[PDB]
PDB file of all heavy atoms in Angstrom:
ATOM      1  N   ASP A  55     -52.382 -37.947  47.906  1.00 24.34           N
ATOM      2  CA  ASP A  55     -52.468 -38.519  46.544  1.00 24.34           C
ATOM      3  C   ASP A  55     -51.336 -39.410  46.211  1.00 24.34           C
ATOM      4  O   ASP A  55     -51.270 -40.080  45.176  1.00 24.34           O
ATOM      5  CB  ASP A  55     -52.650 -37.441  45.416  1.00 24.34           C
ATOM      6  CG  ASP A  55     -51.396 -36.463  45.351  1.00 24.34           C
ATOM      7  OD1 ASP A  55     -50.676 -36.446  46.320  1.00 24.34           O
ATOM      8  OD2 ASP A  55     -51.235 -35.836  44.373  1.00 24.34           O
ATOM      9  N   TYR A  56     -50.280 -39.491  47.160  1.00 23.82           N
ATOM     10  CA  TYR A  56     -49.039 -40.181  46.823  1.00 23.82           C
ATOM     11  C   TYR A  56     -49.353 -41.695  46.634  1.00 23.82           C
ATOM     12  O   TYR A  56     -48.783 -42.178  45.552  1.00 23.82           O
ATOM     13  CB  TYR A  56     -48.022 -39.993  47.942  1.00 23.82           C
ATOM     14  CG  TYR A  56     -46.648 -40.783  47.515  1.00 23.82           C
ATOM     15  CD1 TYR A  56     -45.725 -40.018  46.821  1.00 23.82           C
ATOM     16  CD2 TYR A  56     -46.398 -41.992  47.902  1.00 23.82           C
ATOM     17  CE1 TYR A  56     -44.478 -40.577  46.390  1.00 23.82           C
ATOM     18  CE2 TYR A  56     -45.299 -42.636  47.531  1.00 23.82           C
ATOM     19  CZ  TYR A  56     -44.357 -41.955  46.760  1.00 23.82           C
ATOM     20  OH  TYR A  56     -43.133 -42.610  46.469  1.00 23.82           O
ATOM     21  N   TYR A  57     -50.013 -42.257  47.518  1.00 22.35           N
ATOM     22  CA  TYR A  57     -50.345 -43.741  47.304  1.00 22.35           C
ATOM     23  C   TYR A  57     -51.524 -44.004  46.537  1.00 22.35           C
ATOM     24  O   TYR A  57     -51.866 -45.122  46.227  1.00 22.35           O
ATOM     25  CB  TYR A  57     -50.469 -44.420  48.681  1.00 22.35           C
ATOM     26  CG  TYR A  57     -49.095 -44.503  49.245  1.00 22.35           C
ATOM     27  CD1 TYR A  57     -48.818 -43.715  50.404  1.00 22.35           C
ATOM     28  CD2 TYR A  57     -48.064 -45.370  48.779  1.00 22.35           C
ATOM     29  CE1 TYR A  57     -47.480 -43.759  51.020  1.00 22.35           C
ATOM     30  CE2 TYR A  57     -46.836 -45.443  49.316  1.00 22.35           C
ATOM     31  CZ  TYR A  57     -46.538 -44.672  50.358  1.00 22.35           C
ATOM     32  OH  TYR A  57     -45.277 -44.749  51.032  1.00 22.35           O
ATOM     33  N   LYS A  58     -52.188 -42.970  45.953  1.00 22.08           N
ATOM     34  CA  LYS A  58     -53.105 -43.128  44.756  1.00 22.08           C
ATOM     35  C   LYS A  58     -52.335 -43.166  43.438  1.00 22.08           C
ATOM     36  O   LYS A  58     -52.853 -43.783  42.524  1.00 22.08           O
ATOM     37  CB  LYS A  58     -54.017 -41.837  44.722  1.00 22.08           C
ATOM     38  CG  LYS A  58     -55.022 -41.793  45.882  1.00 22.08           C
ATOM     39  CD  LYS A  58     -56.005 -40.636  45.773  1.00 22.08           C
ATOM     40  CE  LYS A  58     -56.888 -40.396  46.999  1.00 22.08           C
ATOM     41  NZ  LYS A  58     -57.642 -41.712  47.469  1.00 22.08           N
ATOM     42  N   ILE A  59     -51.121 -42.560  43.521  1.00 22.26           N
ATOM     43  CA  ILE A  59     -50.288 -42.575  42.182  1.00 22.26           C
ATOM     44  C   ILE A  59     -49.251 -43.633  42.209  1.00 22.26           C
ATOM     45  O   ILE A  59     -49.180 -44.308  41.221  1.00 22.26           O
ATOM     46  CB  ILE A  59     -49.679 -41.129  42.133  1.00 22.26           C
ATOM     47  CG1 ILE A  59     -50.636 -40.044  41.743  1.00 22.26           C
ATOM     48  CG2 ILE A  59     -48.401 -41.298  41.107  1.00 22.26           C
ATOM     49  CD1 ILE A  59     -51.422 -40.381  40.447  1.00 22.26           C
ATOM     50  N   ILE A  60     -48.675 -43.917  43.285  1.00 23.32           N
ATOM     51  CA  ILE A  60     -47.606 -44.945  43.536  1.00 23.32           C
ATOM     52  C   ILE A  60     -48.118 -46.100  44.169  1.00 23.32           C
ATOM     53  O   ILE A  60     -48.445 -46.067  45.396  1.00 23.32           O
ATOM     54  CB  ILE A  60     -46.347 -44.221  44.364  1.00 23.32           C
ATOM     55  CG1 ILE A  60     -45.833 -42.868  43.778  1.00 23.32           C
ATOM     56  CG2 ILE A  60     -45.298 -45.222  44.635  1.00 23.32           C
ATOM     57  CD1 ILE A  60     -45.406 -43.114  42.299  1.00 23.32           C
ATOM     58  N   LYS A  61     -48.140 -47.228  43.367  1.00 21.58           N
ATOM     59  CA  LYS A  61     -48.686 -48.428  43.919  1.00 21.58           C
ATOM     60  C   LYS A  61     -47.588 -49.467  44.111  1.00 21.58           C
ATOM     61  O   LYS A  61     -47.940 -50.609  44.678  1.00 21.58           O
ATOM     62  CB  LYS A  61     -49.765 -49.045  42.902  1.00 21.58           C
ATOM     63  CG  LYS A  61     -50.761 -48.125  42.471  1.00 21.58           C
ATOM     64  CD  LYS A  61     -51.699 -47.792  43.787  1.00 21.58           C
ATOM     65  CE  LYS A  61     -52.957 -47.024  43.345  1.00 21.58           C
ATOM     66  NZ  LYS A  61     -53.818 -46.602  44.529  1.00 21.58           N
ATOM     67  N   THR A  62     -46.358 -49.187  43.680  1.00 23.26           N
ATOM     68  CA  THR A  62     -45.173 -50.117  44.021  1.00 23.26           C
ATOM     69  C   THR A  62     -44.128 -49.179  44.764  1.00 23.26           C
ATOM     70  O   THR A  62     -43.109 -48.938  44.220  1.00 23.26           O
ATOM     71  CB  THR A  62     -44.638 -50.613  42.665  1.00 23.26           C
ATOM     72  OG1 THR A  62     -45.674 -51.194  41.946  1.00 23.26           O
ATOM     73  CG2 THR A  62     -43.626 -51.722  43.083  1.00 23.26           C
ATOM     74  N   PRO A  63     -44.510 -48.755  45.989  1.00 21.51           N
ATOM     75  CA  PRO A  63     -43.445 -48.033  46.660  1.00 21.51           C
ATOM     76  C   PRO A  63     -42.257 -48.793  47.024  1.00 21.51           C
ATOM     77  O   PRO A  63     -42.357 -50.104  47.247  1.00 21.51           O
ATOM     78  CB  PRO A  63     -44.251 -47.679  47.987  1.00 21.51           C
ATOM     79  CG  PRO A  63     -45.346 -48.648  48.120  1.00 21.51           C
ATOM     80  CD  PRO A  63     -45.730 -48.946  46.691  1.00 21.51           C
ATOM     81  N   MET A  64     -41.118 -48.180  47.132  1.00 24.35           N
ATOM     82  CA  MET A  64     -39.849 -48.779  47.542  1.00 24.35           C
ATOM     83  C   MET A  64     -38.890 -47.678  48.099  1.00 24.35           C
ATOM     84  O   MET A  64     -38.980 -46.557  47.626  1.00 24.35           O
ATOM     85  CB  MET A  64     -39.239 -49.518  46.334  1.00 24.35           C
ATOM     86  CG  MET A  64     -37.981 -50.337  46.726  1.00 24.35           C
ATOM     87  SD  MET A  64     -38.258 -51.549  48.103  1.00 24.35           S
ATOM     88  CE  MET A  64     -39.748 -52.422  47.591  1.00 24.35           C
ATOM     89  N   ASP A  65     -38.041 -48.029  48.956  1.00 24.70           N
ATOM     90  CA  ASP A  65     -37.197 -47.194  49.612  1.00 24.70           C
ATOM     91  C   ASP A  65     -35.974 -47.958  50.035  1.00 24.70           C
ATOM     92  O   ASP A  65     -35.917 -49.129  50.204  1.00 24.70           O
ATOM     93  CB  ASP A  65     -37.844 -46.566  50.860  1.00 24.70           C
ATOM     94  CG  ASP A  65     -38.168 -47.521  51.908  1.00 24.70           C
ATOM     95  OD1 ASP A  65     -39.210 -48.286  51.803  1.00 24.70           O
ATOM     96  OD2 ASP A  65     -37.377 -47.712  52.840  1.00 24.70           O
ATOM     97  N   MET A  66     -34.816 -47.188  50.394  1.00 22.04           N
ATOM     98  CA  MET A  66     -33.632 -47.931  50.821  1.00 22.04           C
ATOM     99  C   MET A  66     -33.562 -48.589  52.101  1.00 22.04           C
ATOM    100  O   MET A  66     -32.863 -49.475  52.297  1.00 22.04           O
ATOM    101  CB  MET A  66     -32.418 -46.803  50.595  1.00 22.04           C
ATOM    102  CG  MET A  66     -32.168 -46.186  49.234  1.00 22.04           C
ATOM    103  SD  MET A  66     -30.550 -45.697  49.057  1.00 22.04           S
ATOM    104  CE  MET A  66     -30.505 -44.336  50.251  1.00 22.04           C
ATOM    105  N   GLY A  67     -34.439 -48.027  53.094  1.00 22.47           N
ATOM    106  CA  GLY A  67     -34.656 -48.687  54.266  1.00 22.47           C
ATOM    107  C   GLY A  67     -35.096 -50.191  54.119  1.00 22.47           C
ATOM    108  O   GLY A  67     -34.621 -51.113  54.650  1.00 22.47           O
ATOM    109  N   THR A  68     -36.151 -50.246  53.299  1.00 22.91           N
ATOM    110  CA  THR A  68     -36.714 -51.518  52.936  1.00 22.91           C
ATOM    111  C   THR A  68     -35.615 -52.424  52.230  1.00 22.91           C
ATOM    112  O   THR A  68     -35.500 -53.640  52.439  1.00 22.91           O
ATOM    113  CB  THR A  68     -37.871 -51.326  51.940  1.00 22.91           C
ATOM    114  OG1 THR A  68     -38.924 -50.777  52.767  1.00 22.91           O
ATOM    115  CG2 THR A  68     -38.543 -52.624  51.521  1.00 22.91           C
ATOM    116  N   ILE A  69     -34.936 -51.865  51.285  1.00 21.43           N
ATOM    117  CA  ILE A  69     -33.867 -52.507  50.543  1.00 21.43           C
ATOM    118  C   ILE A  69     -32.779 -53.101  51.463  1.00 21.43           C
ATOM    119  O   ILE A  69     -32.418 -54.253  51.321  1.00 21.43           O
ATOM    120  CB  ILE A  69     -33.205 -51.672  49.371  1.00 21.43           C
ATOM    121  CG1 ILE A  69     -34.316 -51.397  48.353  1.00 21.43           C
ATOM    122  CG2 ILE A  69     -32.075 -52.379  48.739  1.00 21.43           C
ATOM    123  CD1 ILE A  69     -33.916 -50.313  47.367  1.00 21.43           C
ATOM    124  N   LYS A  70     -32.375 -52.299  52.333  1.00 22.15           N
ATOM    125  CA  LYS A  70     -31.341 -52.583  53.392  1.00 22.15           C
ATOM    126  C   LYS A  70     -31.808 -53.838  54.129  1.00 22.15           C
ATOM    127  O   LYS A  70     -31.052 -54.792  54.295  1.00 22.15           O
ATOM    128  CB  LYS A  70     -31.055 -51.540  54.261  1.00 22.15           C
ATOM    129  CG  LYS A  70     -29.908 -51.757  55.316  1.00 22.15           C
ATOM    130  CD  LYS A  70     -29.485 -50.548  56.008  1.00 22.15           C
ATOM    131  CE  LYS A  70     -28.381 -50.721  57.072  1.00 22.15           C
ATOM    132  NZ  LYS A  70     -28.845 -51.508  58.336  1.00 22.15           N
ATOM    133  N   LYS A  71     -33.055 -53.714  54.661  1.00 23.26           N
ATOM    134  CA  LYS A  71     -33.655 -54.954  55.499  1.00 23.26           C
ATOM    135  C   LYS A  71     -33.759 -56.244  54.560  1.00 23.26           C
ATOM    136  O   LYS A  71     -33.476 -57.345  55.036  1.00 23.26           O
ATOM    137  CB  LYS A  71     -34.965 -54.519  56.112  1.00 23.26           C
ATOM    138  CG  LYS A  71     -34.805 -53.533  57.202  1.00 23.26           C
ATOM    139  CD  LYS A  71     -36.191 -53.077  57.658  1.00 23.26           C
ATOM    140  CE  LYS A  71     -36.120 -52.085  58.719  1.00 23.26           C
ATOM    141  NZ  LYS A  71     -37.405 -51.508  59.079  1.00 23.26           N
ATOM    142  N   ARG A  72     -34.196 -56.035  53.331  1.00 26.42           N
ATOM    143  CA  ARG A  72     -34.252 -57.097  52.397  1.00 26.42           C
ATOM    144  C   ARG A  72     -32.906 -57.867  52.223  1.00 26.42           C
ATOM    145  O   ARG A  72     -32.805 -59.088  52.207  1.00 26.42           O
ATOM    146  CB  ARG A  72     -34.907 -56.767  51.029  1.00 26.42           C
ATOM    147  CG  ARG A  72     -36.362 -56.415  51.149  1.00 26.42           C
ATOM    148  CD  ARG A  72     -37.077 -55.926  49.821  1.00 26.42           C
ATOM    149  NE  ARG A  72     -38.509 -56.063  49.955  1.00 26.42           N
ATOM    150  CZ  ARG A  72     -39.377 -56.019  49.036  1.00 26.42           C
ATOM    151  NH1 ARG A  72     -38.919 -55.975  47.741  1.00 26.42           N
ATOM    152  NH2 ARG A  72     -40.602 -56.033  49.300  1.00 26.42           N
ATOM    153  N   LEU A  73     -31.847 -57.129  51.951  1.00 27.85           N
ATOM    154  CA  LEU A  73     -30.603 -57.668  51.859  1.00 27.85           C
ATOM    155  C   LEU A  73     -30.070 -58.286  53.086  1.00 27.85           C
ATOM    156  O   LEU A  73     -29.550 -59.380  53.044  1.00 27.85           O
ATOM    157  CB  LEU A  73     -29.474 -56.546  51.394  1.00 27.85           C
ATOM    158  CG  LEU A  73     -29.694 -56.030  49.939  1.00 27.85           C
ATOM    159  CD1 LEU A  73     -29.021 -54.669  49.791  1.00 27.85           C
ATOM    160  CD2 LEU A  73     -29.054 -57.094  48.997  1.00 27.85           C
ATOM    161  N   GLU A  74     -30.291 -57.674  54.271  1.00 25.92           N
ATOM    162  CA  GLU A  74     -29.942 -58.158  55.597  1.00 25.92           C
ATOM    163  C   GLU A  74     -30.615 -59.516  55.932  1.00 25.92           C
ATOM    164  O   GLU A  74     -30.069 -60.447  56.535  1.00 25.92           O
ATOM    165  CB  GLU A  74     -30.126 -57.202  56.666  1.00 25.92           C
ATOM    166  CG  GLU A  74     -29.151 -56.045  56.624  1.00 25.92           C
ATOM    167  CD  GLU A  74     -29.505 -54.932  57.501  1.00 25.92           C
ATOM    168  OE1 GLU A  74     -30.736 -54.839  58.025  1.00 25.92           O
ATOM    169  OE2 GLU A  74     -28.734 -54.002  57.754  1.00 25.92           O
ATOM    170  N   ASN A  75     -31.924 -59.594  55.494  1.00 28.69           N
ATOM    171  CA  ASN A  75     -32.808 -60.717  55.740  1.00 28.69           C
ATOM    172  C   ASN A  75     -32.603 -61.756  54.587  1.00 28.69           C
ATOM    173  O   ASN A  75     -33.400 -62.828  54.649  1.00 28.69           O
ATOM    174  CB  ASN A  75     -34.219 -60.311  56.014  1.00 28.69           C
ATOM    175  CG  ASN A  75     -34.328 -59.283  57.167  1.00 28.69           C
ATOM    176  OD1 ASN A  75     -33.393 -59.169  57.865  1.00 28.69           O
ATOM    177  ND2 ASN A  75     -35.476 -58.592  57.204  1.00 28.69           N
ATOM    178  N   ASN A  76     -31.784 -61.594  53.646  1.00 29.63           N
ATOM    179  CA  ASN A  76     -31.683 -62.562  52.599  1.00 29.63           C
ATOM    180  C   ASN A  76     -33.015 -62.761  51.750  1.00 29.63           C
ATOM    181  O   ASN A  76     -33.311 -63.876  51.252  1.00 29.63           O
ATOM    182  CB  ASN A  76     -31.148 -64.003  53.105  1.00 29.63           C
ATOM    183  CG  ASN A  76     -29.939 -63.844  53.918  1.00 29.63           C
ATOM    184  OD1 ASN A  76     -30.026 -64.051  55.126  1.00 29.63           O
ATOM    185  ND2 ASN A  76     -28.809 -63.396  53.387  1.00 29.63           N
ATOM    186  N   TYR A  77     -33.702 -61.637  51.562  1.00 29.42           N
ATOM    187  CA  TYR A  77     -34.835 -61.638  50.863  1.00 29.42           C
ATOM    188  C   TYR A  77     -34.875 -61.885  49.375  1.00 29.42           C
ATOM    189  O   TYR A  77     -35.789 -62.427  48.657  1.00 29.42           O
ATOM    190  CB  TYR A  77     -35.616 -60.395  51.204  1.00 29.42           C
ATOM    191  CG  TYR A  77     -37.063 -60.201  50.743  1.00 29.42           C
ATOM    192  CD1 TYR A  77     -38.104 -60.556  51.547  1.00 29.42           C
ATOM    193  CD2 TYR A  77     -37.493 -59.537  49.528  1.00 29.42           C
ATOM    194  CE1 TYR A  77     -39.517 -60.476  51.238  1.00 29.42           C
ATOM    195  CE2 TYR A  77     -38.753 -59.320  49.201  1.00 29.42           C
ATOM    196  CZ  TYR A  77     -39.738 -59.865  50.103  1.00 29.42           C
ATOM    197  OH  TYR A  77     -41.134 -59.604  49.767  1.00 29.42           O
ATOM    198  N   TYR A  78     -33.748 -61.538  48.882  1.00 29.78           N
ATOM    199  CA  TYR A  78     -33.389 -61.533  47.438  1.00 29.78           C
ATOM    200  C   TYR A  78     -32.654 -62.833  47.084  1.00 29.78           C
ATOM    201  O   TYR A  78     -31.566 -63.102  47.711  1.00 29.78           O
ATOM    202  CB  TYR A  78     -32.640 -60.367  46.916  1.00 29.78           C
ATOM    203  CG  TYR A  78     -33.249 -59.022  47.166  1.00 29.78           C
ATOM    204  CD1 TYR A  78     -32.593 -58.120  47.980  1.00 29.78           C
ATOM    205  CD2 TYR A  78     -34.448 -58.595  46.608  1.00 29.78           C
ATOM    206  CE1 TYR A  78     -33.035 -56.794  48.188  1.00 29.78           C
ATOM    207  CE2 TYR A  78     -34.962 -57.245  46.691  1.00 29.78           C
ATOM    208  CZ  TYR A  78     -34.192 -56.392  47.657  1.00 29.78           C
ATOM    209  OH  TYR A  78     -34.704 -55.119  47.833  1.00 29.78           O
ATOM    210  N   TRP A  79     -32.971 -63.544  46.078  1.00 29.08           N
ATOM    211  CA  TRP A  79     -32.130 -64.713  45.590  1.00 29.08           C
ATOM    212  C   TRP A  79     -31.318 -64.271  44.399  1.00 29.08           C
ATOM    213  O   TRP A  79     -30.175 -64.662  44.419  1.00 29.08           O
ATOM    214  CB  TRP A  79     -33.186 -65.777  45.052  1.00 29.08           C
ATOM    215  CG  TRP A  79     -32.504 -67.104  44.652  1.00 29.08           C
ATOM    216  CD1 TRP A  79     -32.301 -67.498  43.366  1.00 29.08           C
ATOM    217  CD2 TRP A  79     -32.101 -68.270  45.558  1.00 29.08           C
ATOM    218  NE1 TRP A  79     -31.648 -68.702  43.316  1.00 29.08           N
ATOM    219  CE2 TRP A  79     -31.581 -69.217  44.553  1.00 29.08           C
ATOM    220  CE3 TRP A  79     -32.154 -68.460  46.828  1.00 29.08           C
ATOM    221  CZ2 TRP A  79     -31.170 -70.385  45.136  1.00 29.08           C
ATOM    222  CZ3 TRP A  79     -31.683 -69.712  47.361  1.00 29.08           C
ATOM    223  CH2 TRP A  79     -31.136 -70.623  46.470  1.00 29.08           C
ATOM    224  N   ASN A  80     -31.798 -63.422  43.516  1.00 29.91           N
ATOM    225  CA  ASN A  80     -31.078 -62.958  42.373  1.00 29.91           C
ATOM    226  C   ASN A  80     -30.798 -61.292  42.616  1.00 29.91           C
ATOM    227  O   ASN A  80     -31.637 -60.583  43.061  1.00 29.91           O
ATOM    228  CB  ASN A  80     -31.989 -63.056  41.165  1.00 29.91           C
ATOM    229  CG  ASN A  80     -31.936 -64.493  40.685  1.00 29.91           C
ATOM    230  OD1 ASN A  80     -31.083 -65.207  40.800  1.00 29.91           O
ATOM    231  ND2 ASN A  80     -33.091 -64.841  39.933  1.00 29.91           N
ATOM    232  N   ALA A  81     -29.638 -60.960  42.242  1.00 31.53           N
ATOM    233  CA  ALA A  81     -29.159 -59.520  42.334  1.00 31.53           C
ATOM    234  C   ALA A  81     -30.163 -58.662  41.606  1.00 31.53           C
ATOM    235  O   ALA A  81     -30.419 -57.479  42.088  1.00 31.53           O
ATOM    236  CB  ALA A  81     -27.686 -59.439  41.831  1.00 31.53           C
ATOM    237  N   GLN A  82     -30.612 -59.097  40.498  1.00 29.92           N
ATOM    238  CA  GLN A  82     -31.557 -58.245  39.680  1.00 29.92           C
ATOM    239  C   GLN A  82     -32.822 -57.801  40.360  1.00 29.92           C
ATOM    240  O   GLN A  82     -33.429 -56.861  40.198  1.00 29.92           O
ATOM    241  CB  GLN A  82     -31.857 -58.906  38.371  1.00 29.92           C
ATOM    242  CG  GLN A  82     -32.689 -58.011  37.431  1.00 29.92           C
ATOM    243  CD  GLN A  82     -32.055 -56.676  37.110  1.00 29.92           C
ATOM    244  OE1 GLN A  82     -30.864 -56.491  36.978  1.00 29.92           O
ATOM    245  NE2 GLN A  82     -32.982 -55.647  36.965  1.00 29.92           N
ATOM    246  N   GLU A  83     -33.269 -58.671  41.469  1.00 28.00           N
ATOM    247  CA  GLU A  83     -34.451 -58.309  42.191  1.00 28.00           C
ATOM    248  C   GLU A  83     -34.192 -57.060  42.987  1.00 28.00           C
ATOM    249  O   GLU A  83     -35.091 -56.225  43.122  1.00 28.00           O
ATOM    250  CB  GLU A  83     -34.905 -59.469  43.221  1.00 28.00           C
ATOM    251  CG  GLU A  83     -35.275 -60.764  42.451  1.00 28.00           C
ATOM    252  CD  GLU A  83     -35.534 -61.869  43.409  1.00 28.00           C
ATOM    253  OE1 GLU A  83     -34.576 -62.619  43.783  1.00 28.00           O
ATOM    254  OE2 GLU A  83     -36.695 -62.012  43.938  1.00 28.00           O
ATOM    255  N   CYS A  84     -32.896 -56.945  43.517  1.00 26.54           N
ATOM    256  CA  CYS A  84     -32.497 -55.806  44.312  1.00 26.54           C
ATOM    257  C   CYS A  84     -32.318 -54.576  43.477  1.00 26.54           C
ATOM    258  O   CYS A  84     -32.791 -53.458  43.769  1.00 26.54           O
ATOM    259  CB  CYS A  84     -31.336 -56.238  45.061  1.00 26.54           C
ATOM    260  SG  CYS A  84     -30.599 -54.817  46.025  1.00 26.54           S
ATOM    261  N   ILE A  85     -31.652 -54.747  42.376  1.00 26.54           N
ATOM    262  CA  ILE A  85     -31.417 -53.724  41.342  1.00 26.54           C
ATOM    263  C   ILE A  85     -32.858 -53.118  40.906  1.00 26.54           C
ATOM    264  O   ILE A  85     -32.976 -51.915  40.906  1.00 26.54           O
ATOM    265  CB  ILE A  85     -30.623 -54.214  40.093  1.00 26.54           C
ATOM    266  CG1 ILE A  85     -29.250 -54.419  40.563  1.00 26.54           C
ATOM    267  CG2 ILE A  85     -30.707 -53.247  38.961  1.00 26.54           C
ATOM    268  CD1 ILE A  85     -28.425 -55.286  39.559  1.00 26.54           C
ATOM    269  N   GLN A  86     -33.856 -53.990  40.677  1.00 26.70           N
ATOM    270  CA  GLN A  86     -35.104 -53.583  40.306  1.00 26.70           C
ATOM    271  C   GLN A  86     -35.800 -52.689  41.331  1.00 26.70           C
ATOM    272  O   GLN A  86     -36.467 -51.746  41.051  1.00 26.70           O
ATOM    273  CB  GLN A  86     -36.130 -54.679  39.994  1.00 26.70           C
ATOM    274  CG  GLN A  86     -37.422 -54.228  39.487  1.00 26.70           C
ATOM    275  CD  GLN A  86     -37.465 -53.197  38.315  1.00 26.70           C
ATOM    276  OE1 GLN A  86     -36.953 -53.619  37.270  1.00 26.70           O
ATOM    277  NE2 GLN A  86     -37.920 -52.034  38.569  1.00 26.70           N
ATOM    278  N   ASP A  87     -35.585 -53.030  42.699  1.00 23.78           N
ATOM    279  CA  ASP A  87     -36.141 -52.363  43.674  1.00 23.78           C
ATOM    280  C   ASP A  87     -35.511 -50.845  43.799  1.00 23.78           C
ATOM    281  O   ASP A  87     -36.199 -49.943  43.984  1.00 23.78           O
ATOM    282  CB  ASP A  87     -35.927 -52.997  45.084  1.00 23.78           C
ATOM    283  CG  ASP A  87     -37.013 -53.965  45.435  1.00 23.78           C
ATOM    284  OD1 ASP A  87     -38.113 -54.008  44.685  1.00 23.78           O
ATOM    285  OD2 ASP A  87     -36.841 -54.822  46.381  1.00 23.78           O
ATOM    286  N   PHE A  88     -34.219 -50.778  43.584  1.00 25.04           N
ATOM    287  CA  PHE A  88     -33.606 -49.398  43.452  1.00 25.04           C
ATOM    288  C   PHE A  88     -34.234 -48.614  42.257  1.00 25.04           C
ATOM    289  O   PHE A  88     -34.695 -47.526  42.498  1.00 25.04           O
ATOM    290  CB  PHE A  88     -32.072 -49.544  43.263  1.00 25.04           C
ATOM    291  CG  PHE A  88     -31.300 -49.684  44.464  1.00 25.04           C
ATOM    292  CD1 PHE A  88     -30.727 -50.890  44.830  1.00 25.04           C
ATOM    293  CD2 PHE A  88     -31.142 -48.546  45.304  1.00 25.04           C
ATOM    294  CE1 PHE A  88     -30.009 -51.047  46.094  1.00 25.04           C
ATOM    295  CE2 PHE A  88     -30.297 -48.713  46.454  1.00 25.04           C
ATOM    296  CZ  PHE A  88     -29.783 -49.966  46.867  1.00 25.04           C
ATOM    297  N   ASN A  89     -34.335 -49.168  41.139  1.00 24.48           N
ATOM    298  CA  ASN A  89     -34.927 -48.535  39.983  1.00 24.48           C
ATOM    299  C   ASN A  89     -36.355 -48.134  40.262  1.00 24.48           C
ATOM    300  O   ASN A  89     -36.776 -46.987  39.794  1.00 24.48           O
ATOM    301  CB  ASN A  89     -34.755 -49.442  38.741  1.00 24.48           C
ATOM    302  CG  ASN A  89     -33.394 -49.516  38.267  1.00 24.48           C
ATOM    303  OD1 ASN A  89     -32.937 -50.540  37.632  1.00 24.48           O
ATOM    304  ND2 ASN A  89     -32.548 -48.554  38.450  1.00 24.48           N
ATOM    305  N   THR A  90     -37.128 -48.990  40.813  1.00 23.67           N
ATOM    306  CA  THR A  90     -38.570 -48.680  41.250  1.00 23.67           C
ATOM    307  C   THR A  90     -38.513 -47.490  42.124  1.00 23.67           C
ATOM    308  O   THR A  90     -39.370 -46.546  41.988  1.00 23.67           O
ATOM    309  CB  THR A  90     -39.197 -49.894  41.945  1.00 23.67           C
ATOM    310  OG1 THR A  90     -39.374 -50.855  41.101  1.00 23.67           O
ATOM    311  CG2 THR A  90     -40.574 -49.485  42.605  1.00 23.67           C
ATOM    312  N   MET A  91     -37.687 -47.351  43.189  1.00 24.37           N
ATOM    313  CA  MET A  91     -37.517 -46.247  44.097  1.00 24.37           C
ATOM    314  C   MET A  91     -37.383 -45.024  43.263  1.00 24.37           C
ATOM    315  O   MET A  91     -38.059 -43.865  43.591  1.00 24.37           O
ATOM    316  CB  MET A  91     -36.449 -46.478  45.078  1.00 24.37           C
ATOM    317  CG  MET A  91     -36.265 -45.311  46.062  1.00 24.37           C
ATOM    318  SD  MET A  91     -34.835 -45.609  47.119  1.00 24.37           S
ATOM    319  CE  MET A  91     -33.457 -45.114  46.144  1.00 24.37           C
ATOM    320  N   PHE A  92     -36.418 -44.939  42.351  1.00 23.20           N
ATOM    321  CA  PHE A  92     -36.118 -43.795  41.573  1.00 23.20           C
ATOM    322  C   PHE A  92     -37.224 -43.416  40.695  1.00 23.20           C
ATOM    323  O   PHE A  92     -37.686 -42.253  40.606  1.00 23.20           O
ATOM    324  CB  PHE A  92     -34.755 -43.923  40.767  1.00 23.20           C
ATOM    325  CG  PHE A  92     -33.568 -44.109  41.576  1.00 23.20           C
ATOM    326  CD1 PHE A  92     -32.816 -45.133  41.345  1.00 23.20           C
ATOM    327  CD2 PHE A  92     -33.329 -43.143  42.560  1.00 23.20           C
ATOM    328  CE1 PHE A  92     -31.554 -45.284  42.130  1.00 23.20           C
ATOM    329  CE2 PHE A  92     -32.116 -43.372  43.320  1.00 23.20           C
ATOM    330  CZ  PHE A  92     -31.266 -44.411  43.109  1.00 23.20           C
ATOM    331  N   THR A  93     -37.856 -44.465  40.019  1.00 26.11           N
ATOM    332  CA  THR A  93     -38.911 -44.122  39.009  1.00 26.11           C
ATOM    333  C   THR A  93     -40.159 -43.531  39.725  1.00 26.11           C
ATOM    334  O   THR A  93     -40.726 -42.674  39.222  1.00 26.11           O
ATOM    335  CB  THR A  93     -39.289 -45.458  38.370  1.00 26.11           C
ATOM    336  OG1 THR A  93     -38.216 -46.046  37.713  1.00 26.11           O
ATOM    337  CG2 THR A  93     -40.391 -45.185  37.233  1.00 26.11           C
ATOM    338  N   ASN A  94     -40.486 -44.030  41.022  1.00 25.70           N
ATOM    339  CA  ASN A  94     -41.594 -43.473  41.755  1.00 25.70           C
ATOM    340  C   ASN A  94     -41.394 -41.987  41.965  1.00 25.70           C
ATOM    341  O   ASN A  94     -42.354 -41.219  41.919  1.00 25.70           O
ATOM    342  CB  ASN A  94     -41.647 -44.157  43.044  1.00 25.70           C
ATOM    343  CG  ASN A  94     -42.119 -45.587  43.032  1.00 25.70           C
ATOM    344  OD1 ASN A  94     -42.717 -46.043  41.902  1.00 25.70           O
ATOM    345  ND2 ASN A  94     -41.846 -46.464  44.082  1.00 25.70           N
TER     346      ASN A  94
END
């Protein structure tokens, strides 16, 4: 049921790679990913 409930998964492994790969242009995009992780 986890992915029936959580449709915007996020985790720090993903966030780390996103930062390393310059995936984010704005800092708030990264902050939102952290907040999504906690909210989930």
